[PDB]
């Protein structure tokens, strides 16, 4: 039972757990924004005129504009498969080095009866090709994600372009309608307002936790060593699960709190929206205005999300290159030693 | 056998998942079909018998912006080409097999025991079986498509109108008489609430279809560990348990969904009965209602028809990859047979 192996294991546990928590939080936020959009919140409670852009939607629009709007997404999409294909090329060249050595090794075997005493290159390259298949898998998974991310984008593009238009053009595209006249400073609107600001602190807090989880750095090597130095054996599992609780248990606690705080807030939001629905218009034009406002909140969310995604994508791809360039060097160094001992 | 236990365990899971999803779809299709048959909610939005009811006009918004009748025309016309493409690949594949097998047969005639390699008919037994099975899938698809085209040719007329602008759509819905005393009556109130409930039910189903589909628990690892630990064990009884643990909470909600609709439809009929008393016993009203109804059938048919073609299209493209691999396998085999032997 080796130390190196046991550390690899621990670091996987810790990676898993962090990555699981972060995905729990992001999955939930997407869902919270999801529900608001389906309810025209916060837009509805800001729409006193019924012929101007609700402020929240305006803030959202400005924001998109501060981030280069549809140009940003376009350029990022334009260059992703190019980074993708650069990685493919290095892996192929990696695997080609091994296939070229092996071909000559085998040709040598067919010519030289007595080569049976030497182990064939075929065997030498087993772990390398195994690593190789794992890279083809990561790359193919990347392409598929890339596919949907594009599919999704192309369906949302037009509304995001609307969201980017100068404020006058923007306001001229939201059908005007009758205000809900009653809302203006009522009990349900005051309620929804605070409920909505609290849910906003839950979302905004979830970025601190994410950073807190990712920056916990603990020296596990010294404990694995200490244990070994003492009992003469390493129980990797019980040891890691113990220290992981100790160091992340506080933060994972908070995650489940954050998740449950959303669940109840979202529940109370639904109830207060019911009573707020009682004073809203069902003119044909009130529906037109509502559809368009909902499209705009959804459009923003997708923008933030497509912009998040593509950025993790290009960073991932870039840091993938460094990783494959080492693999190649390694393949090349193994082939060169093979080719050269004799 | 490990491979044989795993497949079964997975099949049992697909059943639970798919049969749940089926129950939703049929339930929603049924509800819509009942709402249409009673001209709701159009009836309770239709005060002046000379305007297009909001909800019908709104359904009309969806159709026009979904591409209208053009979108359904392209998809339906190219599905038979998509299916014809796939036949050709399967026929090339088997034809390669046929060529080589004829040459093999002839070589065993000329030379007898001086031609000792496995006969090609024996070698190609599972391939021709693959082919046969592919053929079954393509024949089923072709037949299921005829069923879609025929139904659609008998629908399209009404779907045509829905795509027209408001003015021209209205001049196809005859006039009847204003409904002066209905909007705000208690009967209409109770009904409007009933329909609002039923709207929340079929809505929350989408949230369950997704939740059902996108459960990503690794219940196969747990199983394969059990198969490591013990020898021969009770796989079926185990499956029952592990699925109740994972999917149990959702099947519960699914039945709670169906019961809720069961009862809501019951009350709606009761309310409609009472509604069919303040409304007209007019020839003219019967003829307006008749169109209203068909316009709602049309929208429901549009939606379901597009979803079907999109899904029919997706799988015929996917059937292609599958067939290319099978053709490449048939070309690789036939090549070795010519070359390596």
**CATH code for the domain of B116:** 1.20.140.50
Which residue do the tokens 């109740």 mark? Answer: B244
B248 is written with which tokens?
């149990």
Answer yes or no: do A11 and A38 share one domain: yes
Answer yes or no: do B305 and B157 share one domain: yes
What one-character-per-residue DSSP string does B98-155 give? HHHHHHHHHHHHHSSTT--SPPHHHHTHHHHHHHHHHHHHHHHHHHHHHHHHHHHHTT
Q: Identify the closest residue of chain B to A270 by CA–CA distance.
A: B200
Would you say B145 and B79 are in contact if contact means Cβ atoms under 8 Å apart?
yes
**CATH number of the domain enclosing A207:** 1.20.120.560
Size of interface A-B (CB pairs under 8 A): 5
Count of CB atoms within 10 A of residue A213's CB? 20
Domain C-terminal end among A257, A278, A299:
A278
Q: Does B136 touch chain A (CB under 8 A)?
A: no
**% helix, strand, coil for chain B, step of 5:** 80, 0, 20
List all residues 6 or more positions away from A156 whose beta carbon is below 8 Å from its beta carbon: A298, A299, A302, A303, A306
DSSP structure class, residue A255? H
Answer yes or no: do B271 and B209 share one domain: yes
Answer yes or no: do A171 and A297 share one domain: yes
Q: What is the spatial distance between Cα A325 and Cα A143, in angstroms, rounded to a whole number? A: 20
B69 is written with which tokens?
């009748």
Q: Identify the closest residue of chain A to B62 by CA–CA distance.
A: A291
Which residue do the tokens 């924004």 mark? Answer: A33
Beta carbons of A287 and B54 less than 8 Å apart: yes
Answer yes or no: do A152 and A166 share one domain: yes
Would you say B317 and B82 are in contact if contact means Cβ atoms under 8 Å apart?
yes
3-class SS of residue B294: helix
Q: Identify the closest residue of chain A to B196 by CA–CA distance.
A: A274
Backbone conformation region of residue B119, classed left if phi is above 0, alpha if psi is from -120 to 50, else beta: beta
Q: What is the spatial distance between Cα A171 and Cα A293, in angstroms, rounded to a whole number? A: 11
CA B217 vs CA A22, A256, B243: distances in Å: 18, 19, 11
Largest CA distance in chain A: 97
Torsion of CA A204, A205, A207, A210, to 10 degrees: -160
Would you say A77 and A150 are in contact if contact means Cβ atoms under 8 Å apart?
yes
For every residue of A12-33, which 3-state class applies, written as one string? HHHHHHHHHHHHHHHHHHHHHH
In angstroms, the separation between the Cα of residue A203 and the nearest Cα of chain B is 22
A307 is written with which tokens?
């912009």
Which burial class, exposed, middle or buried, applies to A127 when counting CB atoms under 10 A from its CB (0-12, 13-18, 19+)?
exposed
Q: Does A318 touch chain B (CB under 8 A)?
A: no
B261 is written with which tokens?
């609709």
Q: Provide φ and ψ at A323, rounded to 5°.
A: -70, -40
Beta carbons of A287 and B58 less than 8 Å apart: yes
Would you say A45 and A276 are in contact if contact means Cβ atoms under 8 Å apart?
yes
Would you say B337 and B100 are in contact if contact means Cβ atoms under 8 Å apart?
yes
Q: What is the spatial distance between Cα A69 and Cα A170, in angstroms, rounded to a whole number? A: 14
Which residue do the tokens 């008393």 mark? Answer: B277
Would you say B325 and B89 are in contact if contact means Cβ atoms under 8 Å apart?
no
Q: What is the spatial distance between Cα A193 and Cα A198, in angstroms, rounded to a whole number? A: 9
Answer yes or no: do B177 and B190 share one domain: no
CA B38 vs CA B32, B87, B159, B197, B296: distances in Å: 10, 45, 19, 17, 10
Q: What residues in B contact A158, CB-CB < 8 Å?
A: none
Q: What residues in A contact B54, CB-CB < 8 Å?
A: 282, 284, 287
Q: Does B219 touch chain A (CB under 8 A)?
A: no
Q: What is the spatial distance between Cα A157 and Cα B162, in angstroms, rounded to a whole number? A: 27
Long-range pairs, A181-190, Cβ under 8 A, ≥24? A181/A279, A182/A279, A183/A45, A183/A48, A183/A276, A183/A279, A184/A48, A186/A279, A188/A272, A188/A275, A188/A276, A189/A45, A189/A276
Q: Does A144 touch chain B (CB under 8 A)?
A: no
Residue B125 half-sphere exposure toward CB, CA atoms < 13 A: 5
Long-range pairs, B247-256, Cβ under 8 A, ≥24? B247/B16, B247/B17, B247/B20, B247/B212, B247/B215, B250/B20, B250/B208, B250/B211, B250/B212, B251/B16, B251/B20, B253/B208, B254/B20, B254/B23, B254/B24, B254/B208
In angstroms, the separation between the Cα of residue A134 and the nearest Cα of chain B is 20
Q: Identify the closest residue of chain B to A274 by CA–CA distance.
A: B196
Domain C-terminal end among A250, A278, A306:
A278
Closest to B308 measured CA to CA, from B148, B142, B84, B73: B148
Q: Does A148 touch chain B (CB under 8 A)?
A: no
Would you say A263 and A35 are in contact if contact means Cβ atoms under 8 Å apart?
no
Answer yes or no: do A174 and A77 share one domain: yes
Which burial class, exposed, middle or buried, applies to A219 when counting CB atoms under 10 A from its CB (0-12, 13-18, 19+)?
exposed
Answer yes or no: do A161 and A288 share one domain: yes
**% helix, strand, coil for chain A, step of 5:** 85, 0, 15
Q: What residues in B contact A287, CB-CB < 8 Å?
A: 54, 58
Q: What is the spatial distance between Cα A229 and Cα B73, in angstroms, rounded to a whole number? A: 75
Torsion of CA B103, B107, B109, B111, to 10 degrees: 180
In angstroms, the separation between the Cα of residue B55 and the nearest Cα of chain A is 9
Resolution (A): 2.6
Would you say B53 and B45 are in contact if contact means Cβ atoms under 8 Å apart?
yes
Answer yes or no: do A218 and A269 share one domain: yes
Would you say B152 and B76 are in contact if contact means Cβ atoms under 8 Å apart?
yes
Q: What is the spatial distance between Cα A257 and Cα A252, in angstroms, rounded to a whole number? A: 9
Q: What residues in B contact A284, CB-CB < 8 Å?
A: 54, 57
Beta carbons of B57 and A282 less than 8 Å apart: no
List all residues 6 or more positions away from A59 whose beta carbon is below 8 Å from its beta carbon: none
Q: What is the spatial distance between Cα B268 and Cα B191, in angstroms, rounded to a whole number? A: 6
Chain length of chain B: 341
Experimental approach taken: X-ray
Beta carbons of B58 and A282 less than 8 Å apart: no
Would you say B264 and B33 are in contact if contact means Cβ atoms under 8 Å apart?
no
Answer yes or no: do A65 and A40 share one domain: no
Parent domain of B291:
48-181+279-341
Q: Does A75 touch chain B (CB under 8 A)?
A: no
Q: What is the spatial distance between Cα B32 and Cα A243, in angstroms, rounded to a whole number? A: 56
Q: Does B169 touch chain A (CB under 8 A)?
A: no
List all residues 6 or more positions away from A170 whose beta carbon is below 8 Å from its beta carbon: A53, A61, A162, A163
Answer yes or no: do A65 and A153 share one domain: yes
List all residues 6 or more positions away from A206 whose beta carbon is below 8 Å from its beta carbon: A25, A29, A258
Helices then strands (H, E): number in chain A? 11, 0
**Selected residues 278-297 of chain A with any CB under 8 Å from a CB in chain B:** 282, 284, 287
Q: What is the spatial distance between Cα B156 and Cα B171, in angstroms, rounded to a whole number? A: 18
Answer yes or no: do B73 and B177 share one domain: yes
Beta carbons of A282 and B54 less than 8 Å apart: yes
Q: What residues in B contact A147, CB-CB < 8 Å?
A: none
For every residue of A89-137, which 3-state class applies, written as one string? HHHHHHHHHHHHHHHHHHHHHHHCHHHHHCCCHHHHCHHHHHHHHHHHH
Count of CB atoms within 10 A of residue A83's CB? 16
Tally the domains of chain B: 2
Domain C-terminal end among B247, B277, B307:
B277
Closest to A337 measured CA to CA, from A112, A125, A117: A125
A249 is written with which tokens?
């248990």
Peptide bond into A42 cis (omega under 30): yes
């Amino acid at each position: 039972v080796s130390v190196q192996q046991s550390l690899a294991a621990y670091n996987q546990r810790k990676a898993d757990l962090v990555n699981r928590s972060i995905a729990q939080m992001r999955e939930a936020t997407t869902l919270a924004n999801g529900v608001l959009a389906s309810l025209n919140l916060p837009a509805a409670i800001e729409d006193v005129s019924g012929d101007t852009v609700p402020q929240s939607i305006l803030t959202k629009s400005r924001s998109v504009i501060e981030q280069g709007g549809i140009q940003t997404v376009d350029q990022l999409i334009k260059e992703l498969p190019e980074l993708l294909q650069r990685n493919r090329e290095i892996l192929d060249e990696s695997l080609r080095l091994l296939d070229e050595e092996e071909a000559t090794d085998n040709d040598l075997r067919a010519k030289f009866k007595e080569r049976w005493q030497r182990t064939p290159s075929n065997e030498l390259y087993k772990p390398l090709r195994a690593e190789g298949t794992n890279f083809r898998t990561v790359l193919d998974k990347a392409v598929q994600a890339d596919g949907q991310v594009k599919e999704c984008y192309q369906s949302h593009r037009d509304t995001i372009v609307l969201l980017c238009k100068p404020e006058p053009e923007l306001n001229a595209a939201i059908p005007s309608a009758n205000p809900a006249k009653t809302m203006q400073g009522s009990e349900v609107v005051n309620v929804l307002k605070s409920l909505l600001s609290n849910l906003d602190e839950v979302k905004k807090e979830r970025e601190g936790l994410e950073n807190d989880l990712k920056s916990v750095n603990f020296d596990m090597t010294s404990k694995f060593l200490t244990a070994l130095a003492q009992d003469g054996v390493i129980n990797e599992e019980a040891l890691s699960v113990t220290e992981l609780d100790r160091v992340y248990g506080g933060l994972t606690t908070k995650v489940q709190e954050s998740l449950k705080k959303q669940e109840g807030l979202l529940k109370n939001i639904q109830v207060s929206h019911q009573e707020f629905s009682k004073m809203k218009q069902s003119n044909n034009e009130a529906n037109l205005r509502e559809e368009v406002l909902k499209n705009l909140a959804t459009a923003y969310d997708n923008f933030v999300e497509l912009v998040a995604n593509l950025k993790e994508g290009t960073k991932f791809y870039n840091e993938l290159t460094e990783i494959l360039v080492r693999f190649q060097n390694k393949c090349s160094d193994i082939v060169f030693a093979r080719k050269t001992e004799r």
